[PDB]
Amino acid sequence: NVTKHWAKIVGAFCELFERTTRIISRCVLQLLMIETVNELFSNDAVYAQIPSAELLRLMALLKKSFLFAKRFNALKQESGSAATYVAILFRMFSRADVEAALVPLCRDIIRGYTALDDESQHRNIVAWRPVVVDVLEGYAAFPRDAFAAHIRSFYPLVVELLGKDLGQDLRAALLLVLRRVGEVGLG
Amino acid sequence: LKQESGSAATYVAILFRMFSRADVEAALVPLCRDIIRGYTALDDESQHRNIVAWRPVVVDVLEGYAAFPRDAFAAHIRSFYPLVVELLGKDLGQDLRAALLLVLRRVGEVGLG
């Protein structure tokens, strides 16, 4: 339906996320709907046609779902919501509004990945690995000024990743981000 | 082959123990640049023995950068950061992880931290 007035759709989404949030059924619908949002906004046409305010409203809904999941657990729904949210917010890079709503999420997700238990949370580490490497590779998309805007606010959080065992994907992502760090700082 | 790793390992370790002061530095930095480049240029599969041979000394070079003062650490930051950053592209052991982590955290501390 939506691949072929956006306020109505956005309002429907907004008013239905409260319904989505017995309990296992609600969690299943929440997972399916965040996957639906992912599969939808992965399309280039709808992404290019949606107004930015409506997209930000959907992203706020997704952040609310992330916060609800985090509050309950402190599982797959939180990781999926974070992945979709952060990936779309890189796809943004109006600009300042999405920028202010993206850096805290990146800091939180990096801190969570670092603080994950290596042995008792192997499933959580596996779940969070692709989204973390996606964030790290998306830092390459930042311009020169924005990359140095949060260098002092993100370098300590990202340096500690290599202390734990890191995969080849995260290896490459970290290598590119730190080479960019050196280039914009000293290089 | 073993002598090449053995001589360099003894050479860099004593020169790190030095930190007259300028003379030893002029004879230490070029060695550290060469050994770091050599370790990366080692073949991962056809030179696994060489990598194992060069592993204990390269991690010894990196840990010695903690012994440099603030001035000397930033003296060769532009001439040594590009050589060391590519290390983590190849598979790295636990020993090199701590050695790399301390120097780059110091790199940020002396540069931006």
TrEMBL record, chain A:
It is found in: Cytoplasmic vesicle, COPI-coated vesicle membrane. Transmembrane segments: none annotated. This is A7bd1859-5d22-4ce8-aff3-d8d273e6acf0. It comes from Thermothielavioides terrestris.
